[model samples]
Target chain A: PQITLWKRPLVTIKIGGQLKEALLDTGADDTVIEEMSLPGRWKPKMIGGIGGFMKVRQYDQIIIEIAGHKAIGTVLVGPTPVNIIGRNLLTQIGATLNF
Target chain B: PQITLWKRPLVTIKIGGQLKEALLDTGADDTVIEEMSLPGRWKPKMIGGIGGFMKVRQYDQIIIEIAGHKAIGTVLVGPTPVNIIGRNLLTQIGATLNF
Candidate 1:
């Protein structure tokens, strides 16, 4: 049996002139930027979801980079315990998840 | 009587370093990059959707910009005829989907 350790590229997210590092995850269905990590003032309209009103908030935006690729977008604004890199960003890159 | 018009920012997406604009839509659940819009080398695994293996393809990677925000990611690699800025990206920025 052989061993293998996969090291993915860290996605860059710039907030308030600060750059944030996000793990690359194909299994994620969306991008989740922690509320505390929010940068700048950008208020977008609140939309509803499956859980309905159960989710809503505001967060800053930043620059993201992966394997020489880059894209700028907003981060999820919430009090959730964790962050994520999901489908939204993947869609922009034309990549799919296997997990 | 009152009359008003709301103009949202157009999101920027770079395909092969070519900056493109996408309208802001919170109602979308996922970022949908049509097969035709696919960029470089992106081989997507066929995913089973509501119709069961009805949708599948490949795409590329790029940078996304909107409302002074940015994030780099992949796109939906398929022949589906539509592009979107869905809840996934909204959630990343803590956005809600009302419609």
Candidate 2:
């Protein structure tokens, strides 16, 4: 993947009480969520991950923002701490990440 | 607070080599990820949960897909396995979940 520095507004919701940040990654094609951030005694599932197919799971809603464009996305919860911005949330408001 | 799920297409991705799915949740205001599903040597963060304020962590990214529409998002990882569909991805293609 290509690393590009871009800034976009993210909408963040208070989960439990912590404020999470969602970075607008133009290179990424999907909306991503870290695994540990999920709350509310959610269930677990077997899925794929980076290092060649591992046991992963899913998550519900998350609040995030970059500059101000705030919106929540239903995302898959992973084991690492990473949040990405994708076309779904970008094109919704006609915003694109140009890097 | 609202249990209104109409239905819609979603996206799936491969993390740690696992395949994850994202559902279209209309009520949730944020994008959330599951905690236990995260892989690799991930770090933990102190946050909150459903019962009250608790210590939560984060994750990297996960893969997910719905009916047909697929897009990645940056999300906050949580402990539970729950994938939601929110306005961020829903409103993108002018698709509304009417119950």
Candidate 3:
């Protein structure tokens, strides 16, 4: 399906046995979901202690169902204002930007 | 042209007779360029959204050449992590998200 940029490209994404709406973020390099606990051994976001960025837990090799397509990759769990399906998952789903 | 999500979809844009790289941001509703001096009567305010609000100087109907296509739209000048070409200009370039 082709999605126009006239509106937010919000789509249903299934993760952790729940379906949630997430934006298809072409600008974001990493996938970030709203804070939620998922059972997995995850790595915490590392920092050098200067700039302020969202504190998140990086869960690798996570399975996600995005818009009915199966995608597996790293997912960041943190305090994001909205769930964003970034390049990590967008690539898995073979999402492309066309002009 | 089709752009893959393997890397940041950065493209050079011509604005005010100068070229700068910008991200093709499907998730951003409005276009935001980095702090630069452009000749115009602009207004300063905060543009709020799901993630956050940005203090920006909004300029109306700014002419920009994205990639090779000419685009004219409202361009927000501010301190952004990256220069983002959002839906406002993406729509003008006939950009779409496809899977």
Chain B TM-score by candidate, in order shown: 0.49, 0.46, 0.93
Rank order by TM-score, top first? 3, 2, 1
Per-chain TM-score of chain B, candidate 1? 0.49
Of candidate 2 chain A, the 10-residue stretch with the lowest lDDT total is A1-10
Q: Which CAPRI quality tier does the interface of model 1 achieve?
A: incorrect
Best by DockQ: 3
lDDT tens digits, residue span B3-93, model 3: 9999999999999999999999988888888899888799886765434566889999899999999998899988776788999999999
TM-score, second chain, candidate 2: 0.46
DockQ of 3: 0.56
lDDT of 1 by residue, A1-99 (tens): 111112232446544445556544333344555555444675553432222222435453455653345655555655433345444554554442211
RMSD for each model, in Å, please?
15.6, 14.7, 2.6
* Number of the top-ranking candidate, with TM-score as the measure: 3
lDDT (10s digit) by residue, model 2, range B60-89 = 343434344454543446543455444444
Candidate 1 chain A lowest-lDDT run of ten = A1-10
Task: Quote the positional error of residue A23 for candidate 1 in Å.
Answer: 29
DockQ of 2: 0.03
In terms of docking quality, model 2 is: incorrect
Question: Scored by Cα lDDT, where does model 3 land?
Answer: 0.87
If ranked by DockQ, best first, what sequence of candidates would result?
Answer: 3, 2, 1
